[PDB]
Design a protein around this ligand. Structure first.
Ligand code: OVN
Ligand code: MG
Ligand code: ZN
Length: 844
């Protein structure tokens, strides 16, 4: 055994030892219990970043842990390969997105291997390969013929200078983020998944997910946004009917979740596109301008609640069907056409958004709910105004004194009796639009024929292959300019036809890849029935919180779609979910020509603990604030430099020790140095133990007759094993597991293990510590284990707790005062000559 720890000598040998043994190449062996540990697969962007290393180390700790406990562990990896990065890189470097992607994949694969992740590389997938995406084209066609996928005109943001469609996030004050040109709202046909048909199942099945973080479940509930409320029709006043046709001349229909407060409605509000808005605006330029500004808006959903709410009165009136109040119709920017009826009622006393709106425009506020003896203040919002549970009705006529549920039913009865309303259930969830006007994506398997319509491509003809011999130029989607791709014949009639040129939302590939890993080379379906039956669901999913809503909802949706197609048996893809925190790092700047700030990467910096300077010249730079690593402020630390400098095990240890997985991880040079030094300590501890005697049979069995000091070390040992096991398998906090092993080694350092029984206990401590740490730092632990013991580490398995090592000594002594029934003198007095060990006599 070499004296000094050298990661570059031992880490490749260890990786070849694991590959040669094929520990990670698993199959559907019905003998061991399966365990499917999955980390969210990466975009092949070019290189790993520190987020990648954190995620996949966390996955590897859990996978190796379960492996050591006798599970048949599948830990697969692959490439979410489609999307915009390759297209932009194609425009920058004038290369093909496919070629750029396959080079990135090959480089990033090497980096993953070098980190020693116990990954089943025989299950690798690359979603840009036809052998992958053909199966989502297949599923598309089946759902399309069922109407679960459908085509319909939608509205997009067109940038006329960049010639591409932009999301609301990419529109800044009505203009494209890169071009700066005013975007144009354009209606175009697009494809949609009818995800709303699965809304109730997607909502209710969250209750099955006892091992999901409650905040992720809450986020999905709010996103789905089910509500049980009331349709209410307010008759249009006789004086307000000019310009209206059909039912819009007869009544204004709204949806409310608070029909218990219908007595306190003080006005109503409609969307800009509402017919009442159009009729009122017909002769009022201020309304036409307000309608125009509403339509031109591009507010993102994550910002919808943070926008300034504005309205204009229309001079039109409707009648409350329960009290006869004549209420004015306002046009408001927060009422969305297409949500419900595009028209709401307002109760400023009991809805906070209505309270702020009314307060802005000095509109009436009518209290109709009371909660205890709390005073109602029409000029200040108190949180109890909106309480649904503990309130009773007031100022509501014959409805007074009722609670929410009884008021709901009474209003429902009153409205239904006179035909003015009925209970209704709504969802905020919109259908899923999957059409992208981009090249580097999965082709949509639709052929357009003027005789036959939009025709799904037959299963025989799938895939529709995306040509990879393309370099996008940034003047429109290349597929639309490629007659060699889109000119085809109709598969129903054989006539002249055109392929769809839009490609799929790349969320589609990540919505089912966890099933494809089960049988990645299966050529007769999305996933083979034998392999889906064996692996079932993912037992553990690990990934960033930014995917807590869309990706997970899409994946749960696809799983239920595939179940209903008979491809899988589960209702839910992910049993346990762990969400890792961000990786943050200090930023460094040095001002330049125009009173601004230029940003320097941390690896090109050296500190003086005073100030910092550039490593190349030694000239100062300004130390700035800490934030998530990104190209924005040039503060991303390349993990490849971390590996080159210290080795994979140090990288893995620093990530797991620095913070709990959910907590943000702060980059720290001293922290990285401390991780490496601990590995040197571990190395020297085993080396020094073997230098004074070599290996012995580890202590096992009855520990009677062991000295107090060695019994104490065995106690620390098996409590540490218990602590670590509970940290890996239950708390999923690996930092405290590392600290616990560090405490074991501390006590070992203070224990004389020189005797024959001492060496036996020392062997037992070390054999346990290297296995307890092997999930985190497998290369050095594999090497150290081979110096201590000849068995296969993974066949020795996870350390067992010896309960007997946790029972402490006992000795019953009789208490007697005057003859009748330091250490023991204090205990017996808690109930004086002492006979050692048997009796204590209290001279009374
Ligand atoms: C399943 C599909 C939809 C996944 C999709 N292909 C994807 O997100 N791919 S990915 O390649 O972007 O990320 C793959 C994983 O690992 C990384 C995690 C990052 C968490 C955020 N972060 C970043 C940083 C700074 C890093 C250093 C910068 O110099 N700090 N925190 C992801 O959340 C995800 O778990
Ligand atoms: Mg259950
Ligand atoms: Zn045809």
């Amino acid at each position: 055994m070499q004296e000094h720890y050298q990661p570059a000598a031992i880490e490749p040998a260890a990786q070849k030892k694991w590959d040669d043994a094929r520990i990670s190449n698993v199959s559907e062996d019905a003998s061991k219990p399966k365990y499917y540990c999955l980390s969210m697969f990466p975009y092949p962007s070019g290189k790993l970043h520190m987020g990648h290393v954190r995620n996949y180390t966390i996955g590897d700790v859990l996978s190796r842990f379960k492996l050591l406990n006798g599970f048949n562990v599948m830990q697969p990896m692959g490439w979410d390969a489609f999307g915009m990065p390759a297209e932009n890189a194609a425009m920058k470097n004038n290369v093909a997105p496919a070629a750029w992607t396959y080079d990135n994949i090959e480089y990033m694969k090497t980096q993953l291997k070098s980190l020693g992740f116990a990954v089943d590389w025989e299950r690798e997938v690359a979603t840009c390969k036809p052998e992958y995406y053909r199966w989502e084209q297949w599923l598309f066609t089946k759902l399309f013929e069922k109407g679960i996928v459908y085509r319909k005109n939608g509205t997009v943001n067109w940038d006329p200078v960049d010639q591409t469609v932009l999301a609301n996030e990419q529109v800044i004050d009505g203009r494209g983020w890169r071009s700066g040109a005013l975007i144009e709202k354009r209606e175009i046909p697009m494809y949609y998944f009818k995800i709303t048909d699965y809304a109730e199942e997607l909502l209710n099945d969250l209750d099955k997910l006892e091992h999901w973080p409650e905040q992720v479940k809450t986020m999905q509930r709010n996103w789905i946004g089910k509500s049980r409320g009331m349709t209410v029709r307010f008759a249009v006043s006789d004086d307000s009917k000019q310009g209206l046709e059909g039912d819009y001349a007869k009544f204004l229909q709204v949806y409310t979740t608070r029909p218990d407060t219908l007595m306190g409605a003080t006005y109503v509000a409609v969307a800009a596109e509402h017919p009442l808005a159009t009729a009122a605006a017909a002769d009022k330029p201020e309304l036409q301008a307000f309608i125009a500004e509403c339509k031109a808006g591009s507010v993102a959903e994550a910002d919808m609640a943070t926008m300034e709410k504005k309205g204009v009165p229309t001079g039109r009136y409707v009648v409350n069907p329960l009290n006869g109040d004549k209420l004015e119709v306002w046009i408001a920017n927060y009422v969305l056409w297409g949500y419900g009826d595009g028209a709401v009622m307002a109760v400023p006393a009991h809805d906070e958004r209505d309270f702020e709106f009314a307060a802005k425009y000095n509109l009436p506020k009518k209290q109709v709910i009371a909660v205890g003896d709390n005073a109602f203040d029409a000029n200040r919002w108190q949180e109890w105004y909106g309480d649904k549970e503990n309130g009773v009705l007031v100022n509501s006529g014959d409805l007074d004194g009722l609670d929410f549920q009884t008021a709901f039913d009474a209003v429902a009865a009153k409205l239904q009796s006179q035909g003015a309303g009925e209970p209704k259930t709504q969802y905020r969830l919109r259908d899923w639009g999957i059409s992208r006007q981009r090249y580097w994506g999965c082709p949509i398997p639709i052929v357009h024929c003027e005789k036959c319509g939009n025709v799904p491509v037959p299963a025989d003809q799938l895939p529709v292959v995306l040509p990879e011999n393309v370099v996008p130029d940034g003047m429109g989607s290349p597929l639309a300019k490629m007659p060699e791709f889109y000119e085809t014949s109709c598969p129903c009639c054989g006539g002249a036809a055109k392929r769809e040129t839009d490609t799929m939302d790349t969320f589609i590939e990540s919505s089912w890849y966890f099933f494809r890993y089960m049988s990645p080379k299966f050529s007769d379906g999305m996933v083979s029935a034998e392999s889906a039956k064996y692996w079932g669901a993912v037992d553990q999913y690990i990934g960033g919180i930014e995917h807590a809503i869309l990706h997970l909802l899409y994946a749960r949706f696809f799983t239920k779609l595939m179940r209903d197609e008979g491809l899988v048996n589960v209702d839910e893809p992910f049993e346990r979910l762990l969400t890792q925190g961000m990786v943050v790092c200090e930023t460094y700047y040095r001002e330049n020509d125009k009173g601004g700030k230029d940003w320097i990467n941390p690896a090109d910096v050296e500190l003086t603990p005073v100030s910092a300077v550039l490593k190349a010249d030694g000239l100062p730079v300004v130390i700035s604030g800490t934030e998530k690593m990104s190209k924005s402020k040039n503060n991303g630390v390349d993990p490849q430099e971390l590996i080159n400098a210290y080795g994979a095990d140090t990288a893995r240890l620093f990530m797991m020790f620095a913070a709990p997985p959910e907590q943000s991880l702060e980059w720290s040079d001293s922290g990285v140095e401390g991780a490496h030094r601990f590995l040197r300590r571990l190395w020297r501890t085993v080396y020094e133990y073997l230098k004074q005697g070599g290996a012995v049979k580890a202590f096992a069995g009855n520990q009677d007759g062991l000295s107090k000091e060695l019994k104490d070390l065995r106690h620390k040992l098996h409590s540490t094993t218990a602590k670590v096991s509970d940290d890996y398998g239950r708390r999923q906090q690996f930092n405290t597991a590392i600290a616990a092993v560090m405490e074991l080694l501390n006590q070992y350092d203070k224990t004389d293990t020189g005797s024959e029984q001492g060496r036996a206990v020392a062997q037992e401590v070390l054999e346990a510590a290297v296995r307890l740490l092997w999930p985190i730092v497998p290369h050095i632990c594999e090497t150290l284990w081979s110096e201590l013991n000849g068995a296969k580490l993974w066949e020795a398995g996870w350390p067992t707790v010896d309960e007997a090592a946790l029972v402490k000594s006992e000795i019953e002594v009789m208490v007697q005062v005057n003859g009748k029934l330091a250490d023991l003198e204090a205990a017996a007095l808690a109930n004086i000559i002492v006979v050692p060990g048997r009796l204590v006599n209290i001279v009374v």
